[PDB]
Amino acid sequence: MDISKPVGSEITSVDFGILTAKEIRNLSAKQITNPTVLDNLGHPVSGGLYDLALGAFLRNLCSTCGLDEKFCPGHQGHIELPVPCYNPLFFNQLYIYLRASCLFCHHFRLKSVEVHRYACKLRLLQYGLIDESYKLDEITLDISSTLLNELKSKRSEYVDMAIAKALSDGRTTERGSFTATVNDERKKLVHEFHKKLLSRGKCDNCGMFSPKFRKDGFTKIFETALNEKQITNNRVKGFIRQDMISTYILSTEVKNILDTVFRKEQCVLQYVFHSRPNLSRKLVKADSFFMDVLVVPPTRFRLPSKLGEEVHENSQNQLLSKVLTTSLLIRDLNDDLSKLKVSLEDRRVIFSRLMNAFVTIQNDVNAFIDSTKAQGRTVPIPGVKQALEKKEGLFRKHMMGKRVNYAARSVISPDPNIETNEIGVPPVFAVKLTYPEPVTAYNIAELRQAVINGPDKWPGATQIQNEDGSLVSLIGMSVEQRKALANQLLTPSSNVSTHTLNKKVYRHIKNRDVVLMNRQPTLHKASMMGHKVRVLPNEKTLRLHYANTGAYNADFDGDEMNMHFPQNENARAEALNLANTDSQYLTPTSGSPVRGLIQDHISAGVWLTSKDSF
Amino acid sequence: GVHVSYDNSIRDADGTLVQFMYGGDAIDITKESHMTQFEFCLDNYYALLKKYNPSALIEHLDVESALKYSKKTLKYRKKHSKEPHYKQSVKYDPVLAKYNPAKYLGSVSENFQDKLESFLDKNSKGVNEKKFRALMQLKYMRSLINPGEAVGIIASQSVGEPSTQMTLNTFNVTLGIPRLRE
């Protein structure tokens, strides 16, 4: 973080959605088709995981932005899946909508008036109005279509009026009101809706029975044949069709069933899939649950791990190469299928070849996303779900908590000669921990000395940052160069593009600085206080006063403490006025003191304040 | 996310109200210590009067609105002393519910009001009983929890950190951490 580098734009909100296949194909830097990663000699193979279009790799320049390994941010690519695959994360959902739909009229087997009742209640809940969603159930008039359509009209009329009335006042915005209680009422309904959807056996719209769908642990669906009672039901309801004019099921068949159902039941699904009103007016398509392409992350996030001398292959590239082998194989199977056919009859083999092609690519797709959804291979390679939940997870281990710069660790040693608000910093830490101090007229004298002193003499400086943004290390330089740079610190900027800026000096930690002292476990905020730095010569341990022993719950029995050196004035002010030791005399648990003298001082006081003491 | 809002109420990260006032009085625990130590405050009247400098505050606050209301609530409270909680008067609600504690001198918790008035009656002692009342009213004003204070983390830390001291076994009912877990 640089104060000389302000940011004018900011992220106000994050929107969660699904990438469309058409969207990925346009943004893609290169289509990945080759399972090999390197050509002979050592250059990356064209159409492979290490292609230079995905970013700079092996001292070569990127073939998209032209930059080298340092400045190139990396670029996304794509794998064209020869057949659509079920997205592992959304399989359970597409399964619910597959079991809930009629295979004839291609509507949900639940009565349209009941479905509309859920769509109405879910639309009113997009806006913060729960009372109105319950008041909809009060709207009431084997039932005729002319009567049921009037009920749908009266319900829609109340929904449109209740929204407009609340919209007129400050009850709900155009973007819709959303609270935890509103969310509770939404979650309850979306659950009840799917429960009613799955419960119906015989379709309420057209009285014909649909064949039940079963599932296994892996992403694969089967179709159980109808019983003789239900087969005869299809026959007797077969004539009314004319007047209007276990077996494995392929991914394409499921997508085609859901395609029509998501079109015919678009009204309810519009509110089932949108927490707040859909202002973008996007269509809720079934192909969101399916994957026709796979995005190839940039080479930057798929670099081969180097441990000493051995250079190990990246686990993601391995899983991606597997998807590429299967894709080339199905392209050949489809090419042979295209050749031949007059001769057929035994079509049990062509479907058997198809089932294998589909289940193999699906498994390779699953293995890449979530490994615990892929078949056992004679510990497997972790999927992207496993990467986000390795141990505590990416969110807990690398977002909520992080390893930090400008910080030190050491065994604490007692010291009654330092202030109760101070920390004894060893000179080892003082010559390494630096603060970016901007050079000005009021501190030119102080920083000139630090620059002359250099990175090994305290109080010195390890580096100097010019107004152009560049850094000048003082580490290798002798007293002569340092003296010259010090007389060049307050020189006016020739460049008009940086006249606003002034040089910075990365000066050693002085005795006026704030530091954050931490003793783990940090069970309460008093275990992380702000201490005043006191550099003590010829020291190899962090010196701490006895008054701090209580708050940190630290005993000098070989305990360790973390020292954090905040790098800006806002962070300084906070460690000196809010998290500072003196402002932590009383704990917020009971409002009682956690600061005081511990042993020798108590025995000394009883003797010093005694009547006999003159 | 739970913290103190600028409207003195305890609000969650998403603006949803959790409490209308911190502990029903808006007092910072790290301040509520000598707030009942009336004899101490009396012996150090001029020292604390110089601490809680009122000369730079008298133009920013109200000195009567809350004080008048405090008497009206005390009137109806004394009327239904022997009466049970369900039969108690609901005419006038507490002075803290109607007047901002940081803007009105006298909008104090009824617990503090009862304790302060009881001290002035049971102890007849150059400090007047009326000028001491103002100092304690002002002390309460200066003991308010700051808007922005993360009362949520502080609460969980105040329940967590001392629950480490009850890891030891019994020396019938469930105790310590297992009961706290229940």
Binding site: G401, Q520, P521, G558, D559, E560 | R181
Partner: peptide, 28 residues
């Protein structure tokens, strides 16, 4: 045992691998 805890910079709060894991072994 305490010589190892002395150097380890904690990821989070202790861990529920005790009685808590068997109490969490119950669905809604």
């Amino acid at each position: 045992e305490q010589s190892h805890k002395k150097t380890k910079q904690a990821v989070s709060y202790d861990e529920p691998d005790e009685d808590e894991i068997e109490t969490m072994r119950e669905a809604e």
